[PDB]
Design an enzyme around this catalytic site. Structure first.
Site, PDB file in Angstrom:
ATOM      1  N   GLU A 121       4.778   6.996   9.657  1.00  0.00           N
ATOM      2  CA  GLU A 121       5.319   6.228   9.067  1.00  0.00           C
ATOM      3  C   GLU A 121       6.815   6.397   8.859  1.00  0.00           C
ATOM      4  OE1 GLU A 121       4.596   3.106   7.535  1.00  0.00           O
ATOM      5  OE2 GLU A 121       2.684   3.385   8.170  1.00  0.00           O
ATOM      6  N   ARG A 122       7.768   5.575   8.227  1.00  0.00           N
ATOM      7  CA  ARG A 122       9.242   5.467   8.257  1.00  0.00           C
ATOM      8  C   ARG A 122       9.569   6.910   7.906  1.00  0.00           C
ATOM      9  NH1 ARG A 122       7.416   1.206   5.977  1.00  0.00           N
ATOM     10  NH2 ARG A 122       7.722  -0.803   6.835  1.00  0.00           N
ATOM     11  N   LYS A 130       0.839  -1.208   0.144  1.00  0.00           N
ATOM     12  CA  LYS A 130       0.055   0.201  -0.039  1.00  0.00           C
ATOM     13  C   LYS A 130       0.736   1.180  -0.178  1.00  0.00           C
ATOM     14  CE  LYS A 130      -0.208  -0.766   4.839  1.00  0.00           C
ATOM     15  NZ  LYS A 130       0.499  -1.704   4.594  1.00  0.00           N
TER      16      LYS A 130
HETATM   17  N1  LIG Z   1       4.457  -3.828  -7.848  1.00  0.00           N
HETATM   18  C1  LIG Z   1       5.364  -4.413  -6.925  1.00  0.00           C
HETATM   19  N2  LIG Z   1       6.147  -5.262  -7.689  1.00  0.00           N
HETATM   20  C2  LIG Z   1       7.234  -5.934  -6.937  1.00  0.00           C
HETATM   21  N3  LIG Z   1       7.278  -5.846  -5.534  1.00  0.00           N
HETATM   22  C3  LIG Z   1       6.386  -5.210  -5.046  1.00  0.00           C
HETATM   23  C4  LIG Z   1       5.397  -4.438  -5.502  1.00  0.00           C
HETATM   24  N4  LIG Z   1       4.712  -3.722  -4.775  1.00  0.00           N
HETATM   25  C5  LIG Z   1       5.158  -4.227  -3.437  1.00  0.00           C
HETATM   26  N5  LIG Z   1       6.215  -5.203  -3.644  1.00  0.00           N
HETATM   27  C6  LIG Z   1       6.638  -5.634  -2.625  1.00  0.00           C
HETATM   28  O1  LIG Z   1       6.041  -5.571  -1.375  1.00  0.00           O
HETATM   29  C7  LIG Z   1       7.248  -4.903  -0.054  1.00  0.00           C
HETATM   30  C8  LIG Z   1       6.325  -4.305   0.784  1.00  0.00           C
HETATM   31  O2  LIG Z   1       6.692  -2.983   0.625  1.00  0.00           O
HETATM   32  P1  LIG Z   1       5.410  -1.644   0.644  1.00  0.00           P
HETATM   33  O3  LIG Z   1       4.535  -1.590  -0.448  1.00  0.00           O
HETATM   34  O4  LIG Z   1       6.336  -0.589   1.153  1.00  0.00           O
HETATM   35  O5  LIG Z   1       4.740  -2.374   1.928  1.00  0.00           O
HETATM   36  P2  LIG Z   1       3.704  -1.245   2.708  1.00  0.00           P
HETATM   37  O6  LIG Z   1       2.734  -1.293   2.230  1.00  0.00           O
HETATM   38  O7  LIG Z   1       3.724  -1.996   4.212  1.00  0.00           O
HETATM   39  O8  LIG Z   1       4.844  -0.114   3.041  1.00  0.00           O
HETATM   40  C9  LIG Z   1       8.081  -4.001  -1.233  1.00  0.00           C
HETATM   41  O9  LIG Z   1       9.040  -3.760  -0.524  1.00  0.00           O
HETATM   42  C10 LIG Z   1       8.195  -5.090  -2.534  1.00  0.00           C
HETATM   43  O10 LIG Z   1       9.208  -6.188  -1.851  1.00  0.00           O
HETATM   44 MG   LIG Z   2       4.050   1.427   4.549  1.00  0.00          MG
END
Ligand SMILES: Nc1ncnc2c1ncn2[C@@H]1O[C@H](COP(=O)(O)OP(=O)(O)O)[C@@H](O)[C@H]1O
Ligand SMILES: [Mg+2]
Ligand SMILES: Nc1ncnc2c1ncn2[C@@H]1O[C@H](COP(=O)(O)OP(=O)(O)O)[C@@H](O)[C@H]1O
Ligand SMILES: [Mg+2]
Lengths: 458, 55, 460
Positions: free
Chosen positions: A180-181, A154
């Site tokens: 958040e971070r 997300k």
């Molecule tokens: N479109 C995408 N393609 C490839 N990997 C993805 C994609 N979206 C998310 N990820 C993976 O999901 C992990 C979770 O990251 P993130 O989206 O920041 O989670 P959060 O929503 O908690 O921040 C990413 O670091 C990556 O490894």
């Molecule tokens: Mg996040």
């Protein structure tokens, strides 16, 4: 002119003369040693006592310190001068550049626009994302929310929406980082500054290191700037980094304010604390705000009181699931739970609507068969239920897409898929005109021609 | 040919049902983890409501 | 004179302080003028010095602090006896049918002690209800208790209307109906149905409607019990209908929460089983008279296990379970013959004839349940020549348990029927023993007595 009389964690009690007691939400000040600590009063207890939340580290406060009553609420710089600069919850500049040259300052507690002033829009907004603008298209000036557990996508999805909507959009933009971070805030700030769009974005950051008061009021600090830009007649983008932290910070402080716990330890005022914020982030006849909100759901429980009360405040709700990410299918949107107020035959035309509902019907029919497949194996399906299952798996693959902001992860280059170009591909897969291709021909591609072209290599 | 096909039907249904019994057994062990988690959550929520409601 | 004063009002809960000589006893009734209108309070607790916590039996709105309160020196006591037949009354025994003053000769307190184990007499006189399935499958004696279990919309309330009508017209017995937590629409339907059927002058009605504070809905069951006990003491055999136990338990949960008691197993009051035992143990056949009882009990979410139906079971002597699946196929009364049960269905009390007929019917239906899925997968033409006969007789037995009610005539226009136990056993035995293999199935549907099935078949 007042004295501190208690210090419990983040909440401070102050005693004032009977005739000088501050009003609710007025801001006080204390000299916490070689520091200046701002307190925002929450309750007028009896007898001149007043109960406050500290906008900073509470450590080091003695009893009996002397606090000064500023006679106005928290007030932040606002307007054109705050553009391209990073700010505290208190509106102070946090990048090392000079003072903010603001002309005007606004109190962060405001009433929502009247029912009379609202506006409604059918004007669809196009994004490069197949699944979003098939299953859950959203419109200019409306609200979107991304629901997901921890680490399902997300934030990446919100950075892709920023890339696909915010660079190609003329008006200003506002990004509020709520609990958040700080690593991600620095990364985003440098991406913007290195692509020379930073002069159109205003950043407020109240990240997870900070004490509860900052995480509690930073979202209002951001809404105030978005509202100033709205009232100037412009149209604005407002991105909120995680709105769940805004209620979590309230849960952390609630019991110290002396209030009885509610259903799962949540504050008793959860729905009101949430509505009083989300009712002022709206478009109006004088200008419009388009907003995307990431919404953490704790322990993947979509029925927890906080996501459950948040659902009602959004136009398009995109629900991300861990059981789809674990298959490597990104973005991990759950198409049997994503929905939009805009998905109507009158708004998106009959072909888009009909394709969306066909996709939902196939995927739900596939969900219904997953238990018999689990027990008795797939060979016990009728000859056409096997066809349903094969098409459902092809559709599951085809909703995946590569993103420009995920190259760092997979190396594959990003793809931008137009709407006209995706309803055609899904009409094709459903009608049966691509049964020959293998499933993996659809995984992580753009348009359908890339799938027929990928099948040639297996 | 008919009779060999009949013996083959039986020898195939046997292995299919063996696999199905093993799948049912491997599914019980997941349903029971979900069940224990729900049992614990219910005890906790009830007892917390009582205690933190009183006084 | 009035000797107390209100000191708190928090919702339905009112605190009153008296001089420490005149403190009312628990369950005493107080009185106060809530505006131009009287309001009575029931003492729940004596707490601290002089102060007494009470539940208002009415609208709490409009109460000031410091109003004068007068304490009646007796519990809530209601009119009893022949004067109450055909009237409607609220928990306080006031008429709510607009026909004016009751004409009571005597008043009894609604709180009293249950009969000693010394004073009971066991009796095995089976009630005859006139409903085929209830008479055959779930016989119950005088002084017993019967529970109608089921979800919503299955037919508990109209089954109780029909039992009332049959007992009042065929046996001229007095009845009392305690509408615990009554829906006013259903109370008005019930009133008009009983006056139309001409039974009203042998039924006394007590209504605590849903739109009333918890204390009313909690004490209405005791008001009805007190009227039933007054009739019993005259030497009669009254029959007491409680329209939902589940709402008696919810009213108890509400009252217990308001008083601030610490909650128990699923939010139920701590005193659940003791309220239920206070109620259910006054319903018994003493040596002087008898109180029989029929009680509807809603099972929430079909589970049969949450504390309310779980705690009622300890007291019932027979249970009739109603299912919505059977009702949707259109065979009312919708009683399930395989799950309903009775402690009185053994040969020593019902005789080998009745016991044998009941177990025969259960066996035929239990076998038809086996055969249903072979009929589904392999078709009926594969069944044995004995099994096809079992299928036909099970289907006929299954039709013949349905019956048209006298009070359902408003729903379907079909005229109702009363069927004796003798005809019930004769018909079911004839069916099971092949005496009617020549009639079509539909000749048994909604028919009544068995002769009427042969009279109907000629018309088909
Ligand atoms: N479109 C995408 N393609 C490839 N990997 C993805 C994609 N979206 C998310 N990820 C993976 O999901 C992990 C979770 O990251 P993130 O989206 O920041 O989670 P959060 O929503 O908690 O921040 C990413 O670091 C990556 O490894
Ligand atoms: Mg996040
Ligand atoms: N024997 C019957 N004949 C015709 N209709 C019936 C019969 N029993 C129940 N019904 C229908 O069921 C509806 C509700 O039944 P009721 O006894 O009120 O359910 P509940 O047991 O939930 O109170 C009534 O409106 C009535 O139309
Ligand atoms: Mg009912």
């Amino acid at each position: 002119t007042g004295k501190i009389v208690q210090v419990i964690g983040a909440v401070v009690d102050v005693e004032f003369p009977q005739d000088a007691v501050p009003r609710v939400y007025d801001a006080l000040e204390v000299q916490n040693g070689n520091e200046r600590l701002v307190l925002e009063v929450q309750q007028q207890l009896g007898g001149g006592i007043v109960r406050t939340i500290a906008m900073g580290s509470s450590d080091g406060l003695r009893r009996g310190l002397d606090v000064k009553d500023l006679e106005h609420p928290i007030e932040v710089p606002v307007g054109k001068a705050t553009l391209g600069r990073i700010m505290n919850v208190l509106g102070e500049p946090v990048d090392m550049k000079g003072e903010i040259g603001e002309e005007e300052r606004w109190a962060i507690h405001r009433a929502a626009p009247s029912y009379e002033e609202l506006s409604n829009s059918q004007e669809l907004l196009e994004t490069g994302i197949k699944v979003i603008d098939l299953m859950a298209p959203f419109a200019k000036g409306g609200k979107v929310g991304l629901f997901g557990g921890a680490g399902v996508g997300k934030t990446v999805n919100m950075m892709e929406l920023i890339r696909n909507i915010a660079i190609e959009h003329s008006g200003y933009s506002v990004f509020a980082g709520v609990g958040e971070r700080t690593r991600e805030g620095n990364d985003f700030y440098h991406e913007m500054t290195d692509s020379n769009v930073i002069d159109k974005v205003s950043l407020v950051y109240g990240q997870m290191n900070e004490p509860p008061g900052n995480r509690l009021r930073v979202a209002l600090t951001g809404l105030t700037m978005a509202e100033k830009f709205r009232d100037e007649g412009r149209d604005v983008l407002l991105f909120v980094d995680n709105i769940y932290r805004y209620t979590l910070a309230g849960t952390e402080v609630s019991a110290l304010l002396g209030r009885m716990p509610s259903a799962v330890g949540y504050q008793p005022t959860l729905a009101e604390e949430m509505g009083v914020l989300q009712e002022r982030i709206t478009s109006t006849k004088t200008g419009s705000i388009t907003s995307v909100q990431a919404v953490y759901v704790p322990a993947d429980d979509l029925t927890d009181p906080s996501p459950a009360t948040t659902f009602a405040h959004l136009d398009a709700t995109v629900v991300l699931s861990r059981q789809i990410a674990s298959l490597g299918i990104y973005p991990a949107v759950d198409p049997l739970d994503s929905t939009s107020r805009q998905l109507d035959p009158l708004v998106v035309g009959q072909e888009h609507y009909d394709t969306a509902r066909g996709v939902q019907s196939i995927l739900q029919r596939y969900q219904e068969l997953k238990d018999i497949i689990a027990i008795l194996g797939m060979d016990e399906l009728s000859e056409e239920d096997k066809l349903v299952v094969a098409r459902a798996r092809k559709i599951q693959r085809f909703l995946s897409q590569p993103f420009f902001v995920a190259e760092v992860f997979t190396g594959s280059p990003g793809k931008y898929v137009s709407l006209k170009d995706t309803i055609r591909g899904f009409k094709g897969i459903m009608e049966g005109e691509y049964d020959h291709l293998p499933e993996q021909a659809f995984y992580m591609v753009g348009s359908i021609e890339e799938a027929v072209e990928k099948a040639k290599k297996l | 040919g008919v009779v060999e096909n009949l013996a083959s039907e039986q020898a195939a249904r046997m292995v299919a049902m063996k696999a199905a019994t093993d799948n049912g057994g491997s599914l019980i062990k997941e349903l029971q983890l979900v069940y224990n988690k729900a049992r614990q959550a219910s005890i906790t929520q009830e007892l917390t409501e009582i205690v933190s409601g009183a006084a």
